[PDB]
Design a protein around this motif. Structure first.
Motif, PDB file in Angstrom:
ATOM      1  N   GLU A   1      16.615   3.703   8.344  1.00  0.00           N
ATOM      2  CA  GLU A   1      16.412   5.024   7.761  1.00  0.00           C
ATOM      3  C   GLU A   1      15.122   5.154   6.953  1.00  0.00           C
ATOM      4  O   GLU A   1      14.421   6.158   7.053  1.00  0.00           O
ATOM      5  N   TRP A   2      14.803   4.141   6.147  1.00  0.00           N
ATOM      6  CA  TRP A   2      13.576   4.176   5.368  1.00  0.00           C
ATOM      7  C   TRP A   2      12.356   4.045   6.293  1.00  0.00           C
ATOM      8  O   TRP A   2      11.327   4.678   6.060  1.00  0.00           O
ATOM      9  N   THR A   3      12.468   3.220   7.332  1.00  0.00           N
ATOM     10  CA  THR A   3      11.356   3.058   8.266  1.00  0.00           C
ATOM     11  C   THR A   3      11.108   4.389   8.974  1.00  0.00           C
ATOM     12  O   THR A   3       9.958   4.732   9.252  1.00  0.00           O
ATOM     13  N   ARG A   4      12.173   5.148   9.251  1.00  0.00           N
ATOM     14  CA  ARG A   4      12.006   6.447   9.895  1.00  0.00           C
ATOM     15  C   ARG A   4      11.127   7.355   9.025  1.00  0.00           C
ATOM     16  O   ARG A   4      10.221   8.019   9.527  1.00  0.00           O
ATOM     17  N   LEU A   5      11.387   7.380   7.721  1.00  0.00           N
ATOM     18  CA  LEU A   5      10.597   8.204   6.808  1.00  0.00           C
ATOM     19  C   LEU A   5       9.158   7.693   6.757  1.00  0.00           C
ATOM     20  O   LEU A   5       8.197   8.469   6.765  1.00  0.00           O
ATOM     21  N   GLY A   6       9.000   6.379   6.710  1.00  0.00           N
ATOM     22  CA  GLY A   6       7.656   5.829   6.677  1.00  0.00           C
ATOM     23  C   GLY A   6       6.875   6.271   7.906  1.00  0.00           C
ATOM     24  O   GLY A   6       5.693   6.628   7.819  1.00  0.00           O
TER      25      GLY A   6
ATOM     26  N   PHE B   1      -0.241   5.854   2.041  1.00  0.00           N
ATOM     27  CA  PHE B   1       0.311   5.086   0.931  1.00  0.00           C
ATOM     28  C   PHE B   1       1.830   5.336   0.890  1.00  0.00           C
ATOM     29  O   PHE B   1       2.618   4.413   0.699  1.00  0.00           O
ATOM     30  N   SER B   2       2.239   6.578   1.109  1.00  0.00           N
ATOM     31  CA  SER B   2       3.671   6.915   1.124  1.00  0.00           C
ATOM     32  C   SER B   2       4.369   6.140   2.246  1.00  0.00           C
ATOM     33  O   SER B   2       5.459   5.601   2.059  1.00  0.00           O
ATOM     34  N   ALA B   3       3.739   6.101   3.419  1.00  0.00           N
ATOM     35  CA  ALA B   3       4.293   5.373   4.559  1.00  0.00           C
ATOM     36  C   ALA B   3       4.466   3.888   4.188  1.00  0.00           C
ATOM     37  O   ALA B   3       5.510   3.286   4.444  1.00  0.00           O
ATOM     38  N   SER B   4       3.428   3.305   3.602  1.00  0.00           N
ATOM     39  CA  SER B   4       3.469   1.913   3.198  1.00  0.00           C
ATOM     40  C   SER B   4       4.631   1.654   2.241  1.00  0.00           C
ATOM     41  O   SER B   4       5.406   0.713   2.433  1.00  0.00           O
ATOM     42  N   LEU B   5       4.768   2.499   1.222  1.00  0.00           N
ATOM     43  CA  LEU B   5       5.844   2.334   0.248  1.00  0.00           C
ATOM     44  C   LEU B   5       7.214   2.475   0.938  1.00  0.00           C
ATOM     45  O   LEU B   5       8.142   1.718   0.655  1.00  0.00           O
ATOM     46  N   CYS B   6       7.350   3.427   1.859  1.00  0.00           N
ATOM     47  CA  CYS B   6       8.626   3.568   2.562  1.00  0.00           C
ATOM     48  C   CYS B   6       8.961   2.328   3.391  1.00  0.00           C
ATOM     49  O   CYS B   6      10.121   1.920   3.451  1.00  0.00           O
ATOM     50  N   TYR B   7       7.963   1.727   4.035  1.00  0.00           N
ATOM     51  CA  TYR B   7       8.231   0.525   4.834  1.00  0.00           C
ATOM     52  C   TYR B   7       8.672  -0.629   3.921  1.00  0.00           C
ATOM     53  O   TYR B   7       9.529  -1.456   4.291  1.00  0.00           O
ATOM     54  N   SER B   8       8.088  -0.668   2.724  1.00  0.00           N
ATOM     55  CA  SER B   8       8.399  -1.709   1.749  1.00  0.00           C
ATOM     56  C   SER B   8       9.837  -1.545   1.274  1.00  0.00           C
ATOM     57  O   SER B   8      10.593  -2.516   1.215  1.00  0.00           O
ATOM     58  N   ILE B   9      10.208  -0.307   0.939  1.00  0.00           N
ATOM     59  CA  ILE B   9      11.566  -0.009   0.485  1.00  0.00           C
ATOM     60  C   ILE B   9      12.586  -0.410   1.557  1.00  0.00           C
ATOM     61  O   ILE B   9      13.666  -0.901   1.243  1.00  0.00           O
TER      62      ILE B   9
ATOM     63  N   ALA C   1       4.808  -7.759 -10.014  1.00  0.00           N
ATOM     64  CA  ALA C   1       6.039  -6.986  -9.959  1.00  0.00           C
ATOM     65  C   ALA C   1       7.154  -8.036 -10.012  1.00  0.00           C
ATOM     66  O   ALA C   1       6.885  -9.226 -10.194  1.00  0.00           O
ATOM     67  N   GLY C   2       8.402  -7.612  -9.874  1.00  0.00           N
ATOM     68  CA  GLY C   2       9.492  -8.577  -9.931  1.00  0.00           C
ATOM     69  C   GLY C   2       9.582  -9.563  -8.770  1.00  0.00           C
ATOM     70  O   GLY C   2       8.632  -9.752  -8.010  1.00  0.00           O
ATOM     71  N   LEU C   3      10.736 -10.215  -8.648  1.00  0.00           N
ATOM     72  CA  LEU C   3      10.967 -11.155  -7.568  1.00  0.00           C
ATOM     73  C   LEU C   3      11.460 -10.366  -6.353  1.00  0.00           C
ATOM     74  O   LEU C   3      11.513 -10.897  -5.253  1.00  0.00           O
ATOM     75  N   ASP C   4      11.817  -9.098  -6.572  1.00  0.00           N
ATOM     76  CA  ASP C   4      12.322  -8.223  -5.508  1.00  0.00           C
ATOM     77  C   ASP C   4      11.359  -7.094  -5.116  1.00  0.00           C
ATOM     78  O   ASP C   4      11.763  -6.127  -4.478  1.00  0.00           O
ATOM     79  N   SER C   5      10.088  -7.218  -5.475  1.00  0.00           N
ATOM     80  CA  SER C   5       9.112  -6.177  -5.168  1.00  0.00           C
ATOM     81  C   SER C   5       7.834  -6.783  -4.574  1.00  0.00           C
ATOM     82  O   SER C   5       7.535  -7.937  -4.813  1.00  0.00           O
ATOM     83  N   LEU C   6       7.087  -6.015  -3.792  1.00  0.00           N
ATOM     84  CA  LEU C   6       5.850  -6.538  -3.200  1.00  0.00           C
ATOM     85  C   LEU C   6       4.644  -6.097  -4.028  1.00  0.00           C
ATOM     86  O   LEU C   6       4.687  -5.053  -4.691  1.00  0.00           O
ATOM     87  N   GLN C   7       3.569  -6.880  -3.974  1.00  0.00           N
ATOM     88  CA  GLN C   7       2.367  -6.561  -4.731  1.00  0.00           C
ATOM     89  C   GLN C   7       1.758  -5.230  -4.324  1.00  0.00           C
ATOM     90  O   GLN C   7       1.021  -4.634  -5.093  1.00  0.00           O
ATOM     91  N   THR C   8       2.068  -4.752  -3.118  1.00  0.00           N
ATOM     92  CA  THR C   8       1.544  -3.466  -2.647  1.00  0.00           C
ATOM     93  C   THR C   8       2.419  -2.253  -3.054  1.00  0.00           C
ATOM     94  O   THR C   8       2.151  -1.121  -2.650  1.00  0.00           O
ATOM     95  N   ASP C   9       3.458  -2.497  -3.851  1.00  0.00           N
ATOM     96  CA  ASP C   9       4.365  -1.442  -4.319  1.00  0.00           C
ATOM     97  C   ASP C   9       3.801  -0.683  -5.518  1.00  0.00           C
ATOM     98  O   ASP C   9       4.465   0.199  -6.060  1.00  0.00           O
TER      99      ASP C   9
END
Lengths: 395, 396
Positions: free
Chosen positions: B82-87, B107-115, B181-189
């Protein structure tokens, strides 16, 4: 950093490239394979539309002579327009029945693959498109009524990933090991299975040549058919396949690899079909290699990991990919019958290359896919080839 | 292709414990949505709602029907799906837009793929592929941006550390902030962090994944988990785009734990440090509290620490090593680095006592409790406080 300019060349090669380009007079960087891509499943009219949008764009190109070199990622860009078509197929699969959605997703997968074509290692857009091709294919398998298993075989510190396609799991099925060209992905041949092999419960096991897709971490080396030997050696433990009825199908250089395998594993292979495979000519003749289009050279450079490319030198070291030079096409013929064919006029796979293979194969034959005759040309040739392989397998 | 929540293996009595607390809490989600609200500052609320409604509304089979986000397999309703669809939608729109707008859509697409890959568990294949989509989109967004983003590769321990340097321009050396960022986040977030906050004062942002995360996944998360950020700090002298004499640090969650540690180890090259929601001591020193954390929290710990089978009892015991107090940093002398330590009211991972401890052992340090429980206020307030603290030191 648009695709056609990613690969760097030595000064003298840049001059050679410019001359070949001038001589060719082609309006495209990429080698267009409209007929084959349709055979693989792309709708002719959607293809026409995508390519026309690429062609009509007014956005700046890396080389205005090459219609497919729009630099920015926006309308006109090759990866973008093809990705848009793939998305259209994928979106529509929303409220469809599972079967119709499965097929919509397989079409999506091919579009994404083409979007990344020729799949240069350094191409950011192609790398992403390869992911999209893979997710689409796996989504399609989720919806399909056919069985698609992703197999993992440990080999040389890594793992080989292959996809096994079955009509059912009620008895061992003869299997056809398939490998596409260096500029194609293993998920680009669903139609081969669905429109042919599936008709007789013949399974299809796809594999990426070393340096391609899932096998991108395996260098080519002089033993470039090794991942297939690895896969062949694992067949016995896969209960759904009959390791005594193994056939092979290779496209382009993948075909060169299938012939090698046909000699190395003579006693374990039933039959083999190759299409448009470079067997000797191009590799044993430096000047011919030196006349090939830039896209073809960028692929070779990319798969071999050539940083700054020297075509003259490269054209000299390719003779090793000749199955004649390797010594397979000289003494004893292989017991494996091989049907070698290619389209008329293909510089990569001249008639002579295929005549060579047939000569050194017990019962081998070299057919030339003709033009001018639509109803008994491309589509029919492919059909007969297919039929013949089955016969060897089913019999 | 196991579904995310089912990827981590637990010992029978650990699974038993996990089942008791899941039953006790009665939460409807495996993933911690409240936590995801940090990154969600980058995605439009209306879109969050739409993606989450599709996930929760799905009729497709779930690993656990209690957890709405655990639809198994890659088809409608699945979280990554579902998140990839939005990305993908954002990516498609980008190609029809121009200039900065196009840049932002990527950038929005990138963040959605990350989520889509969140929480980024090691063995999660869908999350791994989503990470590739995230990284490729981020690079395409940078190409369209008027802002400069350089992907740096620093050789370290027979490897390479990948970091992203974000700059308003390269006309002169700029003050720079190293982020984790945390242990659950990417540097590109964190494009938002730079674009809407650091950028206004031409402060550069240099992101880096902690060991076992993203680009640094191959680096084991040892006891010296701040080493990659330490190695990046040392490369600064060579990067002419930055003023290595004006370096700050921002650490989120466990990332904050790493920046405090670095703030004690390099008191001369660090001019200021801000941390938000960082687990400094309480949780790692209390196995009883840790044992009651949601399964996703533990799954992440286990994945980053590289465990094969997880025993929550032993794991809780292993974490004591992460307390900055247990390590001796928060006990003797204060660090000369000015540290601002804050967290939201009621964070079970970063209590006020944890942040007071950090402020105490920091000359001119300060702890702050954002009494808010709403993200809108909690984010703007905490971030507005962070930037101010940084500017005072860095723009000096």
């Amino acid at each position: 950093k648009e695709t056609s300019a990613l690969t760097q060349y030595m000064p003298t090669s840049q001059s050679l490239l410019d001359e070949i380009k001038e001589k060719n007079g082609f309006s495209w960087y990429r080698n267009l394979r409209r007929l084959q891509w349709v055979w693989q499943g792309v709708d002719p009219i959607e293809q026409e539309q995508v390519l026309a949008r690429i062609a009509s764009s007014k956005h700046s190109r890396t080389d205005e002579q090459w219609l497919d070199t729009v630099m920015g990622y926006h309308s006109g860009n090759w990866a973008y327009e093809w990705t848009r078509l793939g998305m259209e197929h994928q979106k529509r699969a929303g409220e469809m029945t599972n079967e119709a959605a499965s097929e919509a997703l397989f079409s999506a997968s091919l579009c994404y693959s083409i979007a990344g074509y020729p799949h240069l290692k350094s191409d950011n857009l192609a790398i992403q498109a390869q992911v999209l091709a893979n997710s689409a294919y796996l989504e399609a398998a989720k919806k399909s009524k056919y069985i698609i298993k992703q197999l993992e075989i440990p080999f040389e510190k890594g793992k080989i990933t292959a996809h096994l396609h079955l009509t059912n799991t009620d008895k061992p099925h003869p299997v056809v090991i398939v490998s596409a060209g260096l500029d194609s992905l293993q998920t680009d041949m669903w139609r081969l299975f669905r429109d042919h092999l599936a008709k007789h419960d013949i399974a299809m096991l796809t594999v990426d040549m070393p340096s391609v897709g899932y096998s991108s971490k395996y260098p080519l080396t002089e033993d470039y058919s090794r991942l297939h030997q690895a896969v062949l050696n694992e067949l016995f433990s896969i209960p759904y396949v009959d390791h005594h009825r193994v056939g092979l199908i290779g496209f382009r250089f993948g075909g060169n690899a299938m012939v090698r395998l046909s000699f190395l594993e003579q006693e374990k292979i039933k039959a083999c079909v190759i299409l448009g495979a470079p067997i000797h000519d191009i590799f044993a003749s430096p000047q011919k290699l030196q006349q090939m289009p830039k896209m073809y050279l960028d692929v070779l450079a990319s798969r071999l990991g050539k940083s700054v490319v020297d075509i003259y030198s490269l054209s000299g070291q390719m003779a090793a990919w000749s199955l004649k030079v390797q010594g397979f096409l000289s003494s004893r013929k292989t017991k494996v019958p091989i049907l070698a064919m290619s389209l008329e006029g293909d510089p990569v796979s001249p008639y002579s290359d295929n005549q060579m293979v047939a000569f050194f194969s017990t019962y081998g034959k070299a057919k030339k896919i003709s033009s001018k005759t639509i109803t008994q040309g491309y589509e029919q040739s492919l059909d007969l080839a297919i039929k013949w392989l089955e016969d060897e397998l089913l019999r």
